[PDB]
Amino acid sequence: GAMGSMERASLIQKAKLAEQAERYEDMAAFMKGAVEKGEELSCEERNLLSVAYKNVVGGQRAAWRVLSSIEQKSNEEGSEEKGPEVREYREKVETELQGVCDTVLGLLDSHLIKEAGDAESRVFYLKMKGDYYRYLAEVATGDDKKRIIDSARSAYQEAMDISKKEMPPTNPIRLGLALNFSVFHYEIANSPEEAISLAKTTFDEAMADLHTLSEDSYKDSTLIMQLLRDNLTLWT
């Protein structure tokens, strides 16, 4: 690893600098280096890891969508033949995206998940596993696709089971997990009714627990609840 010679603490410091500079590929590489030191990650460090890779894969996903739309239009009747270039370049972006997803999944498997015993860490990592399989599913074609979809589902379901047993219904990790699993149902699994049910139940159970919270915790939870509401408005 190119980061093998750098101190763990220096990697974390530089990840924070890279975030401030909006250098997310650098941020991700620093955080990968930190994970590969072999120690467990703190809450803050888990968030740095997530932010870094979310921003990298988010740019790739957006690019893929642009290119896929151009490719689909090329395949309409009356569209002039333009050669292999759109497909080739879509495939290039796709392969790079898959590579980033495989890198994240690899970190989770070696060895973040197996060392994570506390509910906050275990749920966090299992949610990430679901998310990165979901991104793989977005570009998958076939029943290859089926096994990827099932991997996402399984990770999300294990995270949900732990979160319901171990965390309050307002916990931001639990809420963001439920939000993302509802998106999985709607966008990936062709299960809009399951998506809507999950978002509704999650919102309502969180609303009933807000009275327990401090001002600052209330703000954190209500931010995510608003996203559940925004999806329900789009979907109904």
């Binding site: 969508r65 998310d131 963001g176 939000l179 998106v183 709607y186 966008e187 998506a195 996203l227 999806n231």
Partner: peptide, 8 residues
């Protein structure tokens, strides 16, 4: 369909 918001 794809416009649904995931966690930030």
């Amino acid at each position: 369909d794809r416009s649904g918001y995931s966690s930030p």
